[PDB]
Structures are given as C-alpha cells and as structure tokens.
Amino acid sequence: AFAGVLNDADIAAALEACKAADSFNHKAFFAKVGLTSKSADDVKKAFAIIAQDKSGFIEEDELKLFLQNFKADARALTDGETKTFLKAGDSDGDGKIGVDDWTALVKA
Ligand SMILES: [Ca+2]
C-alpha cells in the first residue's frame, strides 16, 4: 500500500488498535503502521497520497478523515484526536500540516 511504503498487514493492525473512539494517537499509529522507520522520501510519498488539497496542506477538518485514507469505511477521528494530532504536527503555527510538518512529526 501507499506506493509500496506500507504493507496491508501492518495497516490492518494499526486500524484495529485504534477502533475505539479517542484511542488514536498519531505516534502510536505511525509506529505500528511502520512509517516511523521509513526514509523521508517514503514518508513524503505517504503525505502526498494522503493530502487531498491541491494547496499541499492538511486542515484539521481533513485530519478527521485520516484513517479513511487507509480503509474506506474506517471511523472518523474525534475532535479531541484531531485537535491533538494538529497541535503536535503543526510546528510552524499556520493551522495546517504541510509536508515539512508531516515529515518532522512522523520522524520525531
Ligand atoms: Ca503548519
């Protein structure tokens, strides 16, 4: 999956780990799905696939649909989860996550 960067089994396990509302954590997910150990180049590919906006930036509203990039009928993140995700990843403060924010977040 994701241009071969992630394998189906890891993704399945990561989604099962966070089925419960408010059980998602970006760091836990990145680890389990196996992205954290990937090269920046692969990490950035994952970002480009995930980001829906031609602007190149992911808004909080879109983060809500985060798991649905991995499985179409996955749950939406809760507002608590998206708030947490956004605060951790928006290193520069513009309210969004760009590729730079994403790469730093994943690999930190
Ligand atoms: Ca930002």
Curated annotation (Swiss-Prot):
Ca(2+) 1 binds at A51, D53, S55, F57, E59, E62. Residues 38-73, 77-108 form the EF-hand domain. SUPFAM superfamilies: EF-hand (SSF47473). GO terms for cellular component: cytoplasm. PANTHER family: PARVALBUMIN, PARVALBUMIN ALPHA. In muscle, parvalbumin is thought to be involved in relaxation after contraction. It binds two calcium ions. One of its GO terms (molecular function) is calcium ion binding. Ca(2+) 2 binds at D90, D92, D94, K96, D101. The modification N-acetylalanine is found at A1. Keywords: Acetylation, Calcium, Metal-binding, Muscle protein, Repeat. InterPro entries: EF-hand-dom_pair, EF_Hand_1_Ca_BS, EF_hand_dom, Parvalbumin. This is Parvalbumin beta. It comes from the Eukaryota. This parvalbumin has an isoelectric point of 4.25. Belongs to the parvalbumin family. Pfam families: EF-hand_7.
